[PDB]
Write a protein that binds this DNA or RNA. Sequence first.
RNA 1: CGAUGUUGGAUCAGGACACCCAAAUGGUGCAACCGCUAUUAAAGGUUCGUUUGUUCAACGAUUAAAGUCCUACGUGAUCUGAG
RNA 2: CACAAACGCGUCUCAGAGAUAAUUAAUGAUUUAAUCUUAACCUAAUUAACUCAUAAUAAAUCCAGCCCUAGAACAGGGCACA
Lengths: 162, 266, 38, 97, 38, 177
Amino acid sequence: FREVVEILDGKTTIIEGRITETPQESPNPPNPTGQCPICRWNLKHKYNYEDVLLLSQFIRPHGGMLPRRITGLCQEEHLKIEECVKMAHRAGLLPNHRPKLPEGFVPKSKPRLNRYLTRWSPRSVKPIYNKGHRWNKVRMPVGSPLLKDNVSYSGRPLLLYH
Amino acid sequence: EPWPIHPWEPGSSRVGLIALKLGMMPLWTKDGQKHVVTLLQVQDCHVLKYTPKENHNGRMAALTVGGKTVSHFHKSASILEFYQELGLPPKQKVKIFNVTENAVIKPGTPLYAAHFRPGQYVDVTAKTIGKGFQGVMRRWGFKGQPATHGQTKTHRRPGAISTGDVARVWPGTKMPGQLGNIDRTAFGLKVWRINTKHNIIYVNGSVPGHKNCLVKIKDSKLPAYKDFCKNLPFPTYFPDGDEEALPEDLYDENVCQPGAPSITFT
Amino acid sequence: FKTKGVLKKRCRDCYLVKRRGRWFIYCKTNPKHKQRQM
Amino acid sequence: AAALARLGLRAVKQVRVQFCPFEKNVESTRTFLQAVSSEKVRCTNLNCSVIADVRHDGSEPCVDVLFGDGHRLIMRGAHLTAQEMLTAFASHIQARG
Amino acid sequence: GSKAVTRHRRVMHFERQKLMAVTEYIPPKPTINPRCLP
Amino acid sequence: SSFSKAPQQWATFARVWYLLDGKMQPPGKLAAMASVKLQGLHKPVYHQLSDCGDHVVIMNTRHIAFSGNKWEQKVYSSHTGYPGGFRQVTAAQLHQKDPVAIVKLAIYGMLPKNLHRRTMMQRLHLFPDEDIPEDILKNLVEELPQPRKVPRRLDEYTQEEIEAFPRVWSPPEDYRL
RNA sequence: CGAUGUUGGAUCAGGACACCCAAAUGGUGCAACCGCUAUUAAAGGUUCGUUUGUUCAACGAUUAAAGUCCUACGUGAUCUGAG
RNA sequence: CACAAACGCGUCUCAGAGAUAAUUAAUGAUUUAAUCUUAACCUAAUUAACUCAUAAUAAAUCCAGCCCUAGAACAGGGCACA
Ligand SMILES: [Mg+2]
Ligand SMILES: [Mg+2]
Ligand SMILES: [Mg+2]
Ligand SMILES: [Mg+2]
Ligand SMILES: [Mg+2]
Ligand SMILES: [Mg+2]
Ligand SMILES: [Mg+2]
Ligand SMILES: [Mg+2]
Ligand SMILES: [Mg+2]
Ligand SMILES: [Mg+2]
Ligand SMILES: [Mg+2]
Ligand SMILES: [Mg+2]
Ligand SMILES: [Mg+2]
Ligand SMILES: [Mg+2]
Ligand SMILES: [Mg+2]
Ligand SMILES: [Mg+2]
Ligand SMILES: [Mg+2]
Ligand SMILES: [Mg+2]
Ligand SMILES: [Mg+2]
Ligand SMILES: [Mg+2]
Ligand SMILES: [Mg+2]
Ligand SMILES: [Mg+2]
Ligand SMILES: [Mg+2]
Ligand SMILES: [Zn+2]
Ligand SMILES: [Zn+2]
């Protein structure tokens, strides 16, 4: 991995690019002929929002996702992983992947509401005051439709709207 | 054995008094305006019992204050026993004041009208003049029906009380009933004058309740008069502590005193 | 801002951004091109 | 080039880019030189002196910017990307000067 | 009683609705996705 | 088995106190099992007319979790009766005002709609935190399992498990995060 | 149809927002004052008079404004009977 | 205003915090640029509602009779200074 360091001395600035050792891929993938990382490690339709050990492999230290041209994923797997990362960040998983602000960490606010499988942004949803009757019912989306193809051991389809 | 006296704090609340509404008197200001003040006489105001903050509200302590003395022969056994343990004759009105823990006073302590000072705002709580079962026109100010253009037995009726589709009347409907005998509070009444000899407060404006009624008076709780407790005696007024008698009448900075040079404008 | 059901860019400087759950045509050169998806 | 043109390079004295074209990690520095020696950058300030030093054994591509605040910004670019180098240079120019 | 041809989509019988739901098209699905297959 | 009639009756129809931790648990999944225990549908001697019903003590009520955006989408509607007195409060606002309210309403809704609902609601004790009076604490018998398995956050993971999990991709050395 | 009593007005109004006023903003062929549109918001208000039975309508004087509707074209076991 | 009262035409008083919708910007990935973010992290300027500070009530088991600024009845306040 590459880092940029800045040095200031006597109104003179020097920026340097330092390369440190980075982890490499594990020696034995179960499906070596796959052209895609997830699809060759046999994790397709196998991860969820709570699999942080996989979701944190490729995200920036401040929580941002990594570009597809760098990660190597196929488009659908990239979208699924991006949605899973968003859901984990909203649920509260990955607590060390946030920027550090000492000035803003002191003014504590109201306690965070526990949540999980959150599809939309918490600040963009309006409360459903009407809620409809049985024939026209306003359903609350839960989870994401991108993960509707995950393996279901019980056989019951996931309730994405409830 | 007085309880320890604590220094005043920005978020402190004081105890109040239970006075008697004597009457109403005119008063004049040095600028020429004329106000009307109510006389509240502190006849015999005492602290009866103390209740801790956690045992009462969890935010403030409760001090119980008793007003004018009554007869022993018309009180219940429990009340008479309570006053016998306390050591004071029975009182007529008993009220509860929410104070801070630093303003607590030992029970049995007397309270005087010098507890308030000329130039201050107070809250006055009392039971208003009860007018009994009053009609809707006097209870709610409803306009009546016309007098003589043909109306038959409807000159003061409320009229329609609800809507046809609802098939009922809402719980907030204004209808004839009791009017007057309820507790009301007047906020932000100015104190103009304190008569120490007779223990009387001259409070600005009107006071709820009939004359010669027991009135619960305390410091104003409006946000505009939150921190005027600084200059006032914080725990209470102790006439035996200063060892110097207060003046018979304490006036405000704008009150035209009875002995005046008959103010003329320049 | 004009509230519309269909958003279209009226120049080359209009950019489409998703905010508050809606889609927006924001424009800096021509502020009259501000459109909000209903 | 457009980013530097829209910055007002009037307050820059000398920019010298010293590199070895036969190396394998001078592409970013060469792109930086091309971006900083463009026609728009030339016309936005004429007194600026742009120098392109070519070596073969230096093996360390670097850039030096000396400007009239008595200030020296030296960037030894062996792993720095051209876009990052341009952004850092633009930020420093708009900060001091 | 509505005509055979209307403008309001002329909601069907429940048996017909069930018939259409059963006879909905089911696209074929390969065992392994071929995008990033060899 | 060879009990006398009265002690056998007391043992068979004795009331039981159950504990339920509500930390990071869905209020609906808490309320379903709480209502089952309250009704007594977990007893083979259960009957509608019999008073077979056990006490349920739910702790960590303030730390419940709603799946999805229910915190901002679910609303609770009340009417004071007076005209203009219809209030619709969001789930988050109701939780801030009163932590007990969300799970209390869920259990009340899931309970049967007969007159026994109030009686078996009087046997439900809800506590915002793990601060239970000793009188109630000494009555507890067993703690029911939490219906939802709470996932562990990344820093809670062991280093052994972190290194055991494989690296599915190899980032380039020149890339900068 | 072995009766669901009508316009208008008086009294009291409940509600909706498709907001007239009051509040926060976007665009203007928005220089300022006046304006024109659109977004969000319904806790509170929304006048007195001449003619007409009038709902409407014209006119006079004002207002921050004198909103559009639903409520058995709200309300006659509360009132009037001008039509 | 021919009752000691009632009354207006007369007099007194009327309030702090949070919260938001539309709409502004700060940092910043997917999309190593930018980008207010149905991307996280803390962010700030911001309607009316609505809640809450705060205020009121908040001492149980004497009640025959007689007064009352208390009241339809029942209730409620007084009956030791004089
Ligand atoms: Mg009376
Ligand atoms: Mg009249
Ligand atoms: Mg008649
Ligand atoms: Mg008559
Ligand atoms: Mg008659
Ligand atoms: Mg009904
Ligand atoms: Mg037919
Ligand atoms: Mg008929
Ligand atoms: Mg009949
Ligand atoms: Mg109304
Ligand atoms: Mg609107
Ligand atoms: Mg306006
Ligand atoms: Mg209105
Ligand atoms: Mg009609
Ligand atoms: Mg009608
Ligand atoms: Mg009727
Ligand atoms: Mg009529
Ligand atoms: Mg009649
Ligand atoms: Mg006629
Ligand atoms: Mg950036
Ligand atoms: Mg910008
Ligand atoms: Mg309160
Ligand atoms: Mg009595
Ligand atoms: Zn793939
Ligand atoms: Zn445009």
